[PDB]
Amino acid sequence: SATQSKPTPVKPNYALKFTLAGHTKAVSSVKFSPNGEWLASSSADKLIKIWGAYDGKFEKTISGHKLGISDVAWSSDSNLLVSASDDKTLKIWDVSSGKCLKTLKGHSNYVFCCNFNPQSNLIVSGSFDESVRIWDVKTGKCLKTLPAHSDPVSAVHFNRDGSLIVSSSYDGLCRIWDTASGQCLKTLIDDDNPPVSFVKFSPNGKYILAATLDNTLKLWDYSKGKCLKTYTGHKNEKYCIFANFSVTGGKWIVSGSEDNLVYIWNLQTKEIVQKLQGHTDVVISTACHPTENIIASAALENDKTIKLWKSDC
Ligand SMILES: CC(=O)[C@@H](C#N)c1ccc(Cl)cc1
Numbered sequence: 581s582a583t584q585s586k587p588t589p590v591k592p593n594y595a596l597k598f599t600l601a602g603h604t605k606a607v608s609s610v611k612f613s614p615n616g617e618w619l620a621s622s623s624a625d626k627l628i629k630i631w632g633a634y635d636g637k638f639e640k641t642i643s644g645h646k647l648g649i650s651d652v653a654w655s656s657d658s659n660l661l662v663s664a665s666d667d668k669t670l671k672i673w674d675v676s677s678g679k680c681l682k683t684l685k686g687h688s689n690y691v692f693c694c695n696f697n698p699q700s701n702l703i704v705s706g707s708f709d710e711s712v713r714i715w716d717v718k719t720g721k722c723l724k725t726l727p728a729h730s731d732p733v734s735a736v737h738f739n740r741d742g743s744l745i746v747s748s749s750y751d752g753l754c755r756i757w758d759t760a761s762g763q764c765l766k767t768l769i770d771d772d773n774p775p776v777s778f779v780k781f782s783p784n785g786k787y788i789l790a791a792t793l794d795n796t797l798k799l800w801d802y803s804k805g806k807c808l809k810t811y812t813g814h815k816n817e818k819y820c821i822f823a824n825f826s827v828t829g830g831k832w833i834v835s836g837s838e839d840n841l842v843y844i845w846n847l848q849t850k851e852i853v854q855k856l857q858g859h860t861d862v863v864i865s866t867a868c869h870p871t872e873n874i875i876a877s878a879a880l881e882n883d884k885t886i887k888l889w890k891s892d893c
């Protein structure tokens with residue numbers, strides 16, 4: 581109908597619904613399962629915990645790492661997790677049984693970041709050892725070691741068909757890699773060169789969102805090599821804080837912050853539309869539910885909790 585219209589944009593109204601207690605040290609990452617049913621958390625306490633995505637109810641603890649965990653990530657079918665640990669390994673877990681399927685050995689220092697590719701036949705990892713590794717999920721063996729950076733690797737992420745990996749480092753660089761060959765296709769340069777603390781592809785793989793330790797998030801068109809948007813106002817000078825695209829309602833950028841708040845920006849206008857108060861330490865990780873307007877946030881060791889926030893839009 582000619583009267584069909586685009587709705588007037590409405591600011592979100594995320595409100596605290598649940599606080600998820602159980603970790604005994606800083607939480608390091610939270611991620612919603614692709615099927616929307618579960619939230620996984622990792623912690624410096626060496627544990628992974630699974631919680632109901634909608635009701636926040638504790639489901640199970642997954643144990644096995646010998647030291648703290650920095651990151652955890654889901655396979656596309658929501659059946660597997662991979663975790664990255666200070667014990668220098670990654671582990672692949674069967675979520676239903678809680679059992680460790682494979683231990684991925686090869687990094688020579690702390691593993692800081694990890695992700696499955698969309699096909700979920702590969703895992704990519706990044707380490708304090710300055711390398712990015714690509715692993716075969718089935719065999720649990722390392723396929724490629726990329727001499728990716730000259731300082732610790734803060735983030736690694738596949739694009740939507742797994743043909744590219746983006747990595748970031750404290751060396752100040754973002755790099756795009758051809759998954760199949762391991763060859764570097766592009767390097768992003770900042771002449772001021774602040775450490776890059778996080779990077780990920782946009783949900784359509786057209787852009788990359790990168791955090792630098794000067795309180796700044798940037799949306800880059802990596803094919804044109806130009807910055808489209810900048811998001812500021814939060815505090816990020818020390819930690820590798822995740823950022824997200826929220827796409828279930830209004831299109832937002834979401835990030836934790838060193839002032840204990842969750843920041844939500846309008847993706848287009850770059851204005852802060854909400855700040856979520858409640859955590860009592862640095863919000864190191866946030867995640868956005870794949871279908872409902874729900875955010876998970878996780879905080880460092882003065883807090884140790886995960887919070888679930890829900891919005892009407
Ligand atoms: C379903 C969506 O909104 C997304 C897709 N695909 C999306 C969101 C934000 C950006 Cl910048 C790109 C793409």
